[PDB]
Amino acid sequence: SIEKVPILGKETIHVGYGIADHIVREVIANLASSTYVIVTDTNMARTPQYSKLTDDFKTNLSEKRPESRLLTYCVSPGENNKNRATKAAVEDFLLQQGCTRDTVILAVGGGVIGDMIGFVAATFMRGVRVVQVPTTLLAM
């Protein structure tokens, strides 16, 4: 149902078809935090499969951690939109939404999202945690 590939000694790459229950049951249970940010693409945001994931992240928070939030960003997709100005947008979105040094930034996107949002998490508050949820076969 799920294969698991070790990286740097820890078994954190989770592989499987239709694992939408296991996406939400693993990060709010093992990686405890207060603010959870889901940054994605806008054409990915209108997809029906993304509504299966966030609504399973919404309603499954109230049973495991009711005093925790859920913020959502939507950056227009494209290499032209992966630049130092649209990096500054979520670099401004997190700071004016009241985010701290414990954010979990779920970068549900492709290669343009996992390159940019991971660089934000490498610079936001001197390093915060990131959960890559890649979607294209190249970025997987």
Place this chain on the structure above:
Amino acid sequence: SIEKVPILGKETIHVGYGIADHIVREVIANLASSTYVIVTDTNMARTPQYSKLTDDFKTNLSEKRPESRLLTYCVSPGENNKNRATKAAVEDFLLQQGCTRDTVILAVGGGVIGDMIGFVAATFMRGVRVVQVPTTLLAMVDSSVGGKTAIDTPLGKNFIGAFHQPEYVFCDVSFLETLPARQFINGMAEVVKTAAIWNEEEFTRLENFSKKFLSVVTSKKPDLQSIKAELVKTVLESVRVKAGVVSSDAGLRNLLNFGHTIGHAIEAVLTPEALHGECVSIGMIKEAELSRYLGILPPVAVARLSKCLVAYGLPVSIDDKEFLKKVGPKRHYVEIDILLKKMIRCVLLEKIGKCYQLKAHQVSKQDLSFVLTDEVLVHPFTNPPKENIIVPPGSKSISNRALILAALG
């Protein structure tokens, strides 16, 4: 001629007065590269002392490595010139001058340069080497050592950055004759923050140092000859205190925020007219007040700690004789409600030179609301101690006599 302070197991912090030969002879010999970048301030670029350094970096590379370059940038000064746009200028200057993952970026500057250029080197080509050459007394003891780098988002000061350790931090003490007296006293706050959380012997010398350090700095040209040896000693036990803690790691590094809780809220409203050591000095006495409030600190400690700060000219309270002139009409932006919510752990001081249980304790808002004001609200007595000894100030009458008699006996 040169002292050397270990950091993270390597002896890379080099301290000494007039070490301009040793700056250039150490980085091109031990840290071999192809491109060498010297980023600095423009008002620092016109200084005569900076021409002693770069021209000793120019002509000494044709001896030691003739197939290597020298690029130079000059960012304009100011607090507002440390931001994500002027970071992008040297982030564009390096890429269009043909730089690679081999660069040595000498950040000859102050705290605004070592915060920004070190963040560039934390991001340029996914991490390159940086040699901090700090110039102001604040940056020699605070921001160079540690590798804490960030820039100024308009929504928040010192929030977006990365952790990147320097390769060499040179404490070039001869770069202090061009410093203004206001910026120079502002660094002597953070030598007291290091000489009052970990050291006590240094603090005893500082009171003997506070006399003629002030007569030589307030004189508008600060003739620093014949006092080189105690000035270089002053920054020694500020970094040794610091690098003794940054090697120990977030655990024990939170002891270096003694005063950086109250002094960051006073900085938060009085930002662009009151400096950083100006408000930490107020936050020192206000946190020495809170530790005295919880029965931890002896009351002779605040009488000595507020003596050393007021001898240096740093403020001891927010309504003090020089701090009112500098801040001016911004003084009335200091209310108890806005200060308190943006502060809550505190470094509770046990005595001068020691911390209480070597950790950071969480105090309530009510005692933090108490120590900042000259207004007391007394609650109904619900539970005094039934056994309670109370020692008032010792009898001055017998004391004065006892010292005379003892001296004669």
Place this chain on the structure above:
Amino acid sequence: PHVDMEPMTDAFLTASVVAAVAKGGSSTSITGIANQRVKECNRIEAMVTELAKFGVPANELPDGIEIHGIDIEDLKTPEISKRGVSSYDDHRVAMSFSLLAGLCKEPVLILERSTTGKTWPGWWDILHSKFKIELDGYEPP
């Protein structure tokens, strides 16, 4: 009934605030305190105004003060009513009325707290740790 203080003049404000809660038919009429005006101010008139702000009568005698005592508790005149306890920046007035202030229901504010730095700069510090009592602070805009 009546106590004279020729050498114990720097004890009057302490004696007055405990006489403020001593109730009975005879009232505490302390005298021989004429030198207490020229310290910093007329503190004889101070006890008249402030003890009226606690609700206990304190008239002015020609060489001292006659102090009543109503109960162990007093009348209810907090910072919500008029003004609080003026200290006139003297250490004697602040530390004396702090003993009296903890007997009401609501907390009694005392203006000008940190003027006790002449004699005991850490009185309020002793009151919380070493006497187990709360203390807050207030700032009028």
